Design a protein around this ligand. Structure first.
Ligand SMILES: [Cu+2]
Lengths: 40, 26, 50, 50, 26
């Protein structure tokens, strides 16, 4: 029940666990996921 | 800006829990 | 009004309607736009592009 | 008649009927692909707020 | 604009059968 990233974050950083779906969806509507992906 | 600000009183109702990133062996 | 302001969660876009009127709207197979376009085909990949 | 009818039609004009019942229906929609666990939890969240 | 608080946790008061832990033989 614990994945391991090879890269993409930084120890100390916080990351959501519960309610992760609704939030991701909210950020998808918000255009956030769109923004993040576009910021490169 | 980036990301998205969500009303704290809602994320509280949702019951949002968070975990802290760390480095170590799997 | 108080309900729409109280009851609400991230991602969950709220909406309020009448029971009977809703049920009608529900089983209602059809299109809401005054003008609609149906592009039909053999493989979804093609039509979706249309 | 002609004079009063002309500027009295250019006023508001909105969709047709609405019937309000006693009790009301609450439909809130979210993105697709939600688990029968989270979606059930979601249902309880809102109901307690309502 | 509603700071209405709510209990995030799952809740059940409408149907939950409970049993008591015992000491005895199989
Ligand atoms: Cu529906």
């Amino acid at each position: 029940g614990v994945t391991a990233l090879r890269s993409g974050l930084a120890e100390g950083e916080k990351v959501v666990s519960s309610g992760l779906f609704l939030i991701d969806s909210e950020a998808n509507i918000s255009g956030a996921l769109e923004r993040m992906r576009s910021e490169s | 800006a980036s990301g998205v600000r969500i009303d704290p009183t809602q994320t509280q109702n949702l019951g949002v829990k968070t975990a802290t990133v760390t480095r170590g062996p799997l | 009004e108080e309900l729409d302001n109280t009851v609400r969660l991230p991602g969950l876009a709220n909406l309020w309607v009448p029971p009977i009127r809703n049920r009608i709207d529900m089983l209602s197979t059809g299109i809401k736009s005054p003008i609609g376009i149906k592009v039909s085909g053999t493989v979804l990949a093609d039509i979706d592009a249309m | 008649v002609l004079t009063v009818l002309w500027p009295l039609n250019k006023v508001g004009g909105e969709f047709l009927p609405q019937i309000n019942e006693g009790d009301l229906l609450y439909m809130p929609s979210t993105l697709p692909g939600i688990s029968a666990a989270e979606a059930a939890s979601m249902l309880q969240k809102t109901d307690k707020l309502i």
